[PDB]
Design a protein around this ligand. Structure first.
Ligand SMILES: [Ca+2]
Ligand SMILES: [Ca+2]
Ligand SMILES: [Ca+2]
Ligand SMILES: [Ca+2]
Ligand SMILES: [Ca+2]
Lengths: 147, 49, 49
């Protein structure tokens, strides 16, 4: 007697909670301790553990764009400064300077699955006679493409 | 009584995980140890690995 | 298309017991799925003697 409207349903939900990556920063105070940086000096500064990239259990491929924003200010203080981002396990995937300001370090399934540390190695020459204190160095980490 | 829509499916997946190569760097400090590089000097420096 | 038959039996075929079997040549339309379809044939005795 009834003419059934023949429609039954099924459903499900998808939970996207976190962002793919956590860029834990441990900043560097490069004149260091028990050391000394003088005006006009030239040298190298090394920090083994600077940016730790922590991924979630699914993320396997990450493309990071590292960018130096205040480089035009440090141009008035340094004469050459070369930052090498000591990548995952000995590889060096990034190089920033006062002129070439963008890096594109990319990590894949082997480098993430062991804990990705990005140290810094800085080659510096202080412009002649410049005396400063607690100069800032700020790098923008953009996650451009993850998978 | 039914007019079957005759379509069955097969599927597969391809996993491209890593990049082809790992360029492990072990940098060189060429004045070395137990050696000396002087101004105006001339020579050769070798690092096998 | 051609829906009528006119099978006629005479004195030799009746006097031995007339069986009429069926042989069906079929092609099922593409994808059709049915169950217990009916096939009904009307037997008219038009003229006997
Ligand atoms: Ca987070
Ligand atoms: Ca993606
Ligand atoms: Ca790799
Ligand atoms: Ca008659
Ligand atoms: Ca008779």
């Amino acid at each position: 007697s009834v003419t059934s409207d023949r429609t039954y349903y099924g459903y499900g939900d998808v939970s996207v909670k976190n962002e793919p990556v956590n860029v834990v920063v441990s900043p560097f105070s490069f004149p260091g301790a028990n050391a000394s940086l003088s005006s006009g000096g030239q040298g190298v500064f090394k920090k083994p553990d600077w940016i730790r990239v922590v991924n979630q259990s699914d993320v396997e491929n990450v493309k990071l764009e590292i960018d130096w924003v205040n480089a035009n200010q440090a141009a008035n203080y340094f004469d050459y400064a070369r930052i090498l981002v000591t990548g995952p396990n000995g590889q060096v995937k990034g190089y920033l300077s006062l002129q070439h300001g963008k890096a594109w370090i990319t990590l894949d399934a082997e480098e993430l699955r062991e804990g990705a540390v990005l140290g810094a190695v800085m080659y510096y020459e202080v412009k002649e006679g410049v005396l400063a204190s607690r100069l800032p160095l700020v790098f923008k980490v953009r996650v451009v493409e993850t998978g």
